[PDB]
Amino acid sequence: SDFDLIVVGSGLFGLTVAERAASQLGKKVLIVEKRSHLGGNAYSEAEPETGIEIHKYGAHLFHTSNKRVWDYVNQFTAFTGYQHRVFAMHNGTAYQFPMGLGLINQFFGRYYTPDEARELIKEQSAEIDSKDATNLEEKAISLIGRPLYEAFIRDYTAKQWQTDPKELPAGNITRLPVRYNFDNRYFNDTYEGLPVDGYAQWLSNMADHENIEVRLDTDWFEVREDLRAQNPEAPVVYTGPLDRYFDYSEGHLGWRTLDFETEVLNTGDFQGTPVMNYNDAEFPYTRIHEFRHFHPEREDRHPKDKTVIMKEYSRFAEEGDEPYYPINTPSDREMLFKYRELADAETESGKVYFGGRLGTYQYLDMHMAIASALSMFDNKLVDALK
Amino acid sequence: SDFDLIVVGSGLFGLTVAERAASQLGKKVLIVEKRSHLGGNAYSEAEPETGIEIHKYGAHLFHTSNKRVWDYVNQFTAFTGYQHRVFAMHNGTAYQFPMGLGLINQFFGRYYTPDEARELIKEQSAEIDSKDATNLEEKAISLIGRPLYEAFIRDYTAKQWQTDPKELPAGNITRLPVRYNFDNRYFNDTYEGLPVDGYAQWLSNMADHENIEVRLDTDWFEVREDLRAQNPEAPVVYTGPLDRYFDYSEGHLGWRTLDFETEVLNTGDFQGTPVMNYNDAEFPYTRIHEFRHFHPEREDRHPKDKTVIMKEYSRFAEEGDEPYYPINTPSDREMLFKYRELADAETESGKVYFGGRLGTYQYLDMHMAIASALSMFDNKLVDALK
Ligand SMILES: Cc1cc2nc3c(=O)[nH]c(=O)nc-3n(C[C@H](O)[C@H](O)[C@H](O)COP(=O)(O)OP(=O)(O)OC[C@H]3O[C@@H](n4cnc5c(N)ncnc54)[C@H](O)[C@@H]3O)c2cc1C
Ligand SMILES: Cc1cc2nc3c(=O)[nH]c(=O)nc-3n(C[C@H](O)[C@H](O)[C@H](O)COP(=O)(O)OP(=O)(O)OC[C@H]3O[C@@H](n4cnc5c(N)ncnc54)[C@H](O)[C@@H]3O)c2cc1C
Ligand SMILES: CC(=O)N[C@H]1[C@@H](OP(=O)(O)OP(=O)(O)OC[C@H]2O[C@@H](n3ccc(=O)[nH]c3=O)[C@H](O)[C@@H]2O)O[C@H](CO)[C@H](O)[C@@H]1O
Ligand SMILES: CC(=O)N[C@H]1[C@@H](OP(=O)(O)OP(=O)(O)OC[C@H]2O[C@@H](n3ccc(=O)[nH]c3=O)[C@H](O)[C@@H]2O)O[C@H](CO)[C@H](O)[C@@H]1O
Ligand code: NA
Ligand code: NA
């Protein structure tokens, strides 16, 4: 047949499943993708005026402690030695971040040793016991105290969730957000970097296989009856929206979206670092990205007098908005459980598997999407394709 | 013969020359080393109470942009992804360091953008033109201004050189010590790391070759007549003290030395970072090293409640002191030039080559010592050994 497997959507989940079927099982794979490009939200592109690599669906930082995933992705791209670091703008000062000896010195006004800082945090957070916290605000305060909470957590969180923190689950904070050293590496994972030639090249390499066919600008729901009629026995891996697949018969799942305001400025350097969080309520955006600093190794390909920045705004996803993060209200969790029963039935009657961020109503980092695809491949598709 | 080449001293210079003669030319090499161990000052050892890897002749950080040197050293050890970062203690606060947007924010009290910081530094340093500077103090001020100079440069420099900065060469500062971004990587080199199994294992691996013989606890001047009588045609590579070789016939070359005060403390973490500079005059030492933080990958081999620190004191080297840094007074430069003429004559009459830090009266980083040895090997010894 012209294909043995259909994959709907070309994000990291779809690409991984398609590439494994194609290279490990020698199967013909047809990838159907609604957008004009591969890669889903991890896709990146050159900004036209400067040539700087930018993102239109959020900045993407790759990090993992999963060696199998790391070895896998390195078949398709090399990675730079980039290490993500973040700074937090509060009341006119850029603080070292996350909370650690650096921020503590800057904020409380003098140097605390590791043991002194531990004692300071005990004092500050004495007010509430975390076992007694009834919401996010109380849980946060019970861990780090009111001054730290009100300076670095309250408004940022309120901007991100569009909700007063008094009205968020205490379960949204599960550990001490404070380091008792000067380590300001943002991620804690064994492996980290950015694709040397950009995400578009990486993701394109995954789909670049003699056994893989890609059809862009193609909505699964517009072509599915025709495609499956060509080969009825071919399974489908669907990574599109779960609720939309079942015609919203159980309701609309709720998502948060993001607005990106991207500007080219006539300066070589706007903030001197890739990411600046804006922790104060007076700024509508949660953070600014300056894309050139993600690839300092490309400095003589970058313009000396221009730079691209991007401001990030968070809000509820309405119709026409890109759905990015599941809201997960108990109402959402309910209709999800109902959709899971429909999906499971659809798998056994129609050989349609559900995966990925949209297909399962679950936020997935890139390495988690890859791990999840590797697992579906190993545990389900090898058997379904013989 | 029992050896084709004699190498005096087993620092990075000696080891490199010995290993190249042994592996590339297939020559028998005898290494003579005065101390009880290999490696010269780069040698490291376990502290007995904690097992933590420490140094007795200064902390050693490996960094280079020389790819040939990098590829060479990786034949003998793997390197961690360690990146050196330093903090500067001034008036009770730990500043981000070297001078950049971080320090500038902390010190001047609010966030300066890259362009604003450039303008601030122009204002601050307007007082003196660097073309008019007559000493180190003026040259420093002409570049970064009096407040920055007096807070972070004056006392530290005075402690290191044991001299008022008004009495040091304006030529000791040759570029703007300020970054207009948030990058606080201490070194600017392409390659950087620490030997995964420590310096002792690395340096021991260099000498570990079927063609290499090592004699520790052996002073060249006590054994040389006997050794050379065994094989008169064998060249000598001498990395011992240049002036001592010629019986101080032209005077004693002047060196600075260091005192190290090493303590085991009953805490798991003293300062939360490998190196803290102490920039104020009230502290006699220039910096404190906390050795465990150089190898965070060894954390579950390190004790949870103890740590080794080391305070570093600088002073003129007297007899009995380890000579570490050439002072290079014009008086020193004079007798050096005289010793160079003696050495050059000794090379052509006695086949004794002079290299390394002590042999040439020149401070050499490890990669520069290796590069210098590789060059002497390529340009002199290949010919001298055929
Ligand atoms: C704002 C944002 C920032 C992120 N930052 C990071 C980060 O820093 N680090 C990290 O590791 N991960 C990050 N991620 C996650 C990253 O994008 C993952 O690769 C992604 O979640 C992988 O899941 P997926 O492959 O299922 O998703 P998707 O990327 O969403 O891919 C799904 C694809 O299916 C297509 N599709 C949908 N419906 C149809 C249909 N009917 N027909 C055809 N095609 C269809 C879509 O067009 C899309 O291309 C971020 C995600 C977002 C949204
Ligand atoms: C305090 C300090 C800190 C340093 N920190 C760094 C750092 O962070 N990064 C970096 O890249 N480099 C650093 N270096 C430099 C590093 O030690 C180099 O490897 C060294 O300078 C290499 O030069 P060498 O091999 O000639 O020197 P040496 O290490 O001095 O080796 C010379 C050897 O010759 C032996 N010897 C002398 N006389 C005789 C004799 N008569 N007979 C027999 N043996 C003899 C000595 O015992 C010694 O082992 C540091 C050096 C010092 C002193
Ligand atoms: C957009 C995105 O892909 N986010 C993911 C990414 O970012 P992060 O979790 O690192 O970024 P983040 O800023 O979105 O989330 C951290 C949370 O901590 C709080 N906070 C954070 C910063 C600050 O200055 N102040 C403050 O209060 C806030 O409540 C926020 O929700 O990696 C995480 C760990 O892998 C999660 O997977 C996140 O979902
Ligand atoms: C001990 C040693 O091996 N030093 C070497 C190493 O350390 P560094 O040069 O990085 O360390 P350093 O502190 O010894 O020297 C920097 C100089 O800047 C000044 N200063 C520095 C720090 C500070 O807080 N305040 C201040 O005023 C001071 O005048 C000092 O002499 O690498 C350098 C670059 O490769 C040189 O090779 C040095 O010789
Ligand atoms: Na508490
Ligand atoms: Na000036």
User: Is residue A86 within a helix (H) or strand (E), and if so which, with residue range?
Assistant: strand A86-90
CA distances from B96 to A96, B39, B178, B276, B293 (A): 9, 33, 12, 10, 17
Ligand 3 atom nearest to A186, measured from its CA: 10
Residues 6+ apart with CB under 8 A from A292: A50, A52, A269, A298, A299, A302, A307, A308
Distance CA B299, CA B295 (A): 7
- Check residue A305 and report its DSSP letter: S
Is the Cβ–Cβ distance between B5 and B30 less than 8 Å?
A: yes
Amino acid type, A40? G
End-to-end CA distance of chain B: 14
CB distance A272–B81 less than 8 Å?
Answer: no
Taking the CA atoms of B324, B325, B326 and B329 in sequence, report the sign of the dihedral they define.
Answer: negative
Distance CA B241, CA A338 (A): 82
- Whether the CB of A98 sits within 6 Å of ligand 1: no
Instruction: Give this entry's resolution in angstroms.
Output: 2.2
Residues in chain B with CB shorter than 8 Å from the CB of A182 are 85, 87, 94, 272-273
Distance CA A298, CA A97 (A): 26
Is the Cβ–Cβ distance between A235 and A5 less than 8 Å?
A: yes
Residues 6+ apart with CB under 8 A from B356: B9, B11, B13, B14, B239, B364, B369, B372, B373
Burial class (CB in 10 A: 0-12, 13-18, 19+), A205: middle
- Check residue A128 and report its DSSP letter: S
CB distance B114–A81 less than 8 Å?
Answer: no
Q: Say which of A83, A182, A267 has its CB closest to residue B273.
A: A182
- Whether the CB of A55 sits within 6 Å of ligand 1: no
For tokens 């050890």, what's the residue? B77
Amino acid type, A385? L
What number of CA atoms fall less than 13 Å from residue A309's CA on the CB side?
18
Is the Cβ–Cβ distance between B65 and B72 less than 8 Å?
A: no
User: Is residue A328 within a helix (H) or strand (E), and if so which, with residue range?
Assistant: none
Joined tokens for residue A213? 């066919």
Taking the CA atoms of B276, B277, B280 and B286 in sequence, report the sign of the dihedral they define.
Answer: positive
Distance CA B62, CA B84 (A): 9
State the SS3 of chain B.
CCCCEEEECCCHHHHHHHHHHHHHCCCCEEEECCCCCCCHHHCEEECCCCCCEEECCCCCCEEECCHHHHHHHCCCCCECCCCCCEEEEECCEEEEECCCHHHHHHHHCCCCCHHHHHHHHHHHCCCCCHHHCCCHHHHHHHHHCHHHHHHHHHHHHHHHHCCCHHHCCHHHCCCCCCCCCCCCCCCCCCEEECECCCHHHHHHHHHCCCCEEEECCCCHHHHHHHHHHHCCCCCEEECCCHHHHCCCCCCCCCEEEEEEEEEEECCCCCCCCCEEEECCCCCCCCEEEEHHHHCHHHCCCCCCCCEEEEEEEEEECCCCCCCCEECCCHHHHHHHHHHHHHHHHHHHHHCEEECHHHHHCCCCCHHHHHHHHHHHHHHHHHHHCC
Q: Say which of B96, B181, B271 has its CB closest to residue A113.
A: B271
Can you spell out the DSSP letters for A31-58? EE-SSSSSSGGG-EEE-TTT--EEESS-
Ligand nearest to the CA of A366: 1
Distance CA A148, CA A125 (A): 10
Residues 6+ apart with CB under 8 A from A279: A88, A89, A90, A151, A152, A153, A155, A156
Residues 6+ apart with CB under 8 A from A237: A5, A6, A7, A8, A14, A17, A18, A352, A353, A355, A376, A381
Distance CA A113, CA A284 (A): 35
Distance CA B47, CA B291 (A): 10
- Whether the CB of B153 sits within 6 Å of ligand 4: yes
Burial class (CB in 10 A: 0-12, 13-18, 19+), A298: middle
For chain A, the residue count is 386
* Phi and psi, residue A259, nearest 5°: -105, 135
Distance CA B339, CA A102 (A): 50
Taking the CA atoms of B162, B166, B167 and B168 in sequence, report the sign of the dihedral they define.
Answer: positive
Ordered by start, the domain boundaries in chain B are 1-83+187-254+329-386, 84-186+255-328
**Nearest CA residue ID for atom 29, ligand 4:** B157
Is the Cβ–Cβ distance between B141 and B177 less than 8 Å?
A: no
User: Is residue A279 within a helix (H) or strand (E), and if so which, with residue range?
Assistant: none
Q: Which of A226, A230, A238 is nearest to A3 (CA)?
A: A230
CA distances from B67 to A278, B73, B367 (A): 41, 10, 10
Taking the CA atoms of A161, A165, A167 and A173 in sequence, report the sign of the dihedral they define.
Answer: positive
- Peptide bond between residue A177 and the one before it cis (omega within 30 degrees of 0): no
Least Cα separation, residue A100 to chain B (angstroms):
10
For A27, the 3-state DSSP assignment is: coil
Residues in chain A with CB shorter than 8 Å from the CB of B293 are 181
Q: Give the β-pairing of B275-278 and B287-290.
A: antiparallel
User: Is residue A294 within a helix (H) or strand (E), and if so which, with residue range?
Assistant: none
CB distance B96–A102 less than 8 Å?
Answer: yes
Is the Cβ–Cβ distance between B271 and B290 less than 8 Å?
A: yes
Residues in chain A with CB shorter than 8 Å from the CB of B89 are 111
Which bin fits A251, alpha (ψ -120 to 50), beta or left (φ > 0)?
left
Distance CA B58, CA B54 (A): 9
Vertex B248 angle, CA B243 and B251, to 5°: 95
CA distances from B345 to A23, B207, B341 (A): 68, 30, 6
For A245, the 3-state DSSP assignment is: helix
- Whether the CB of A21 sits within 6 Å of ligand 3: no
Joined tokens for residue A335? 């209709």
CB distance B102–A111 less than 8 Å?
Answer: no
Distance CA A27, CA A4 (A): 6
Residues 6+ apart with CB under 8 A from B26: B211
Joined tokens for residue B207? 């000498």
Which bin fits A353, alpha (ψ -120 to 50), beta or left (φ > 0)?
beta
CA distances from A265 to A273, A288, A309, B5, B304 (A): 15, 13, 8, 63, 49
Joined tokens for residue B343? 């050495």
Q: Which of B327, B364, B383 is nearest to B14 (CA)?
A: B364
Distance CA B286, CA B220 (A): 35
Distance CA B130, CA B368 (A): 30
Joined tokens for residue A383? 């058997």
Ligand 2 atom nearest to B324, measured from its CA: 53
For tokens 């007297």, what's the residue? B318
Helices in chain A by DSSP H: which ranges? 12-24, 67-73, 101-108, 114-124, 136-144, 146-148, 154-161, 199-207, 220-230, 242-245, 330-350, 356-360, 366-376, 382-384
Q: From the CA atom positions of chain A, what is the Rg in Å?
A: 23
CB distance A93–B115 less than 8 Å?
Answer: no
Contacts of the segment A102-108: beta carbons below 8 A, 24+ positions apart = A102/A182, A102/A184, A102/B94, A102/B96, A103/A152, A104/A178, A105/B93, A105/B94, A106/B106, A107/A147, A107/A148, A107/A151
Burial class (CB in 10 A: 0-12, 13-18, 19+), B79: middle
Contacts of the segment B77-81: beta carbons below 8 A, 24+ positions apart = B77/B195, B77/B196, B77/B197, B77/B201, B77/B202, B77/B205, B78/B195, B78/B196, B78/B197, B79/B191, B79/B192, B79/B193, B79/B194, B79/B195, B79/B196, B80/B193, B80/B194, B80/B195, B80/B196, B80/B295, B80/B297, B81/A81, B81/B193
Least Cα separation, residue A164 to chain B (angstroms):
28
Q: Could you say which of B20, B33, B53, B179 is catalytic?
A: B179
Residues 6+ apart with CB under 8 A from B305: B266, B267, B268
Is the Cβ–Cβ distance between A360 and A336 less than 8 Å?
A: no
- Report the CATH superfamily, name and number, of domain A1-83+187-254+329-386: NAD(P)-binding Rossmann-like Domain (3.40.50.720)
Q: What is the CA(B93)–ligand 5 centre distance, in A?
A: 27
Residues 6+ apart with CB under 8 A from A243: A250, A251, A252, A253, A335, A339, A361
Least Cα separation, residue B106 to chain A (angstroms):
7
Distance CA A208, CA B47 (A): 54
Distance CA A240, CA A77 (A): 26
Residues 6+ apart with CB under 8 A from A88: A94, A95, A96, A97, A103, A152, A276, A277, A279
Is the Cβ–Cβ distance between A113 and B272 less than 8 Å?
A: yes
Ligand nearest to the CA of B125: 6
- Check residue A252 and report its DSSP letter: P
Q: Which of A335, A316, A73, A356 is nearest to A220 (CA)?
A: A356
For A275, the 3-state DSSP assignment is: strand
Distance CA A321, CA A339 (A): 22
CB distance B115–A269 less than 8 Å?
Answer: yes
Amino acid type, A42? A
What number of CA atoms fall less than 13 Å from residue A262's CA on the CB side?
17
Is the Cβ–Cβ distance between A127 and A145 less than 8 Å?
A: yes
Is the Cβ–Cβ distance between B31 and B209 less than 8 Å?
A: no
Is the Cβ–Cβ distance between A97 and A105 less than 8 Å?
A: no
Joined tokens for residue A84? 């993500």
CA torsion, points B282, B286, B288, B294, in degrees to nearest 10?
160
User: Within a 10 A sphere around the Cβ of A281, how many other Cβ atoms?
Assistant: 11
CB distance B114–A85 less than 8 Å?
Answer: no
* Phi and psi, residue A243, nearest 5°: -70, -40
Pocket test for ligand 4, best of B62, B139, B153, B280 (most atoms within 8 A of CB): B153
Amino acid type, A123? E
Amino acid type, A72? Y
* Phi and psi, residue B80, nearest 5°: -70, 170
Joined tokens for residue B140? 């420093």
Q: Give the β-pairing of A5-8 and A29-32.
A: parallel
Q: What are residue A312's DSSP bridge partners?
A: A260, A287
Joined tokens for residue A71? 């070895």
Distance CA A243, CA A223 (A): 19
Q: From the CA atom positions of chain B, what is the Rg in Å?
A: 23
Ligand nearest to the CA of A283: 3
Annotated active-site residue A256? The verdict is: yes
- Check residue A352 and report its DSSP letter: E
Distance CA B87, CA B79 (A): 23
Annotated active-site residue B228? The verdict is: no
Contacts of the segment B45-48: beta carbons below 8 A, 24+ positions apart = B45/B200, B47/B262, B47/B264, B47/B291, B47/B308
Distance CA B242, CA B252 (A): 10
Least Cα separation, residue B114 to chain A (angstroms):
6
Amino acid type, B269? D
Joined tokens for residue A68? 């199998």
Q: Could you say which of A256, A278, A353, A361 is catalytic?
A: A256
Burial class (CB in 10 A: 0-12, 13-18, 19+), A54: buried
Q: What are residue A90's DSSP bridge partners?
A: A93
Amino acid type, A384? A
CA distances from B281 to A111, B157, B168, B249, B260 (A): 18, 10, 18, 39, 18
User: Within a 10 A sphere around the Cβ of A119, how many other Cβ atoms?
Assistant: 12
Joined tokens for residue A103? 């921020």
Distance CA B316, CA B56 (A): 18
Instruction: Give the number of A-B residue pairs with CB atoms closer than 8 Å.
Output: 84
Is the Cβ–Cβ distance between B155 and B280 less than 8 Å?
A: yes
For tokens 């957008």, what's the residue? A35
Annotated active-site residue A185? The verdict is: no
Is the Cβ–Cβ distance between A5 and A381 less than 8 Å?
A: yes
Burial B124-161 (b: 16+ CB within 10 A, else e): bbeebebeebebbbbbbbbbbbeebbebbbbbbbbbbb
